[PDB]
Design a protein around this ligand. Structure first.
Ligand SMILES: O=C1N2C=C(c3ccc(O)cc3)N[C@@H](Cc3ccccc3)C2=N[C@@]1(Cc1ccc2ccccc2c1)OO
Length: 191
């Protein structure tokens, strides 16, 4: 019964969750962001902060390129807020369709590529310390307390780890469907 698989695009809390992220991504307050910037940020984090090998970094870049690409972003194009949020409606729709058909989603492909870098053991799950390292390098969470709230919201495994399958589920609820069970996934960092 639990999980919510229907989009909720007219919910002001959905629009506002993505506007928060648009603003967080628009670090110089240009009112527009490009695919060039998104793939730069992605590879800067993994290579310069998280120890990615060259092959790992390239995999991660392809996943991020495809993800924001699915939201309509392109190299050499500056995407403003109205174009961004309409593109996000298309991304969320396509992702929910793939998920319902048991086909790999762009968010899962990104998770797999990131977790290969972030999980010291390369077995598809991360410790709280590893989650702190990733999110604080990206900047999506600033405080340890918000990082800890992720581990409250998510189902944590028998070793105290957040597995990529569970986090993919949580991301569908949080980014795509406004599932009430996924609120506070990023603590107070992302409304
Ligand atoms: O899910 C993750 N996101 C989501 C976003 C996001 C941004 C805007 C928006 O409107 C919606 C979502 N941004 C980053 C941060 C980022 C942006 C651009 C380049 C590099 C980083 C991010 N990071 C993730 C990465 C992630 C982390 C764990 C995962 C686990 C399973 C599946 C997918 C996963 C994905 O965690 O917060």
């Amino acid at each position: 019964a639990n999980s919510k698989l229907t989009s909720d695009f007219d919910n002001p809390r959905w629009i506002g969750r993505h506007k928060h992220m648009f603003n967080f991504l628009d670090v110089n307050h240009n009112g527009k962001i490009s695919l060039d910037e998104m793939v730069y940020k992605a590879s800067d984090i993994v290579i310069n902060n998280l120890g990615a090998t060259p092959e790992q970094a390239k995999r991660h870049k392809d996943a991020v390129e495809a993800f924001f690409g699915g939201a309509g972003m392109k190299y050499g194009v500056e995407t403003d807020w109205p174009a961004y949020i309409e593109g996000w409606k298309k991304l969320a729709t396509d992702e929910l369709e793939k998920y319902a058909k048991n086909e790999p989603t762009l968010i899962r492909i990104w998770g797999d590529a990131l977790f290969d870098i972030v999980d010291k053991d390369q077995n598809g799950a991360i410790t709280l310390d590893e989650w702190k390292a990733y999110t604080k390098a990206a900047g999506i969470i600033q405080s340890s307390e918000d990082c800890e709230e992720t581990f409250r919201v998510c189902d944590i495994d028998e070793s105290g780890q957040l597995d990529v399958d569970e986090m993919t589920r949580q991301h569908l609820g949080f980014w795509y469907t406004m599932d009430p069970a996924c609120e506070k996934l990023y603590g107070g960092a992302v409304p």
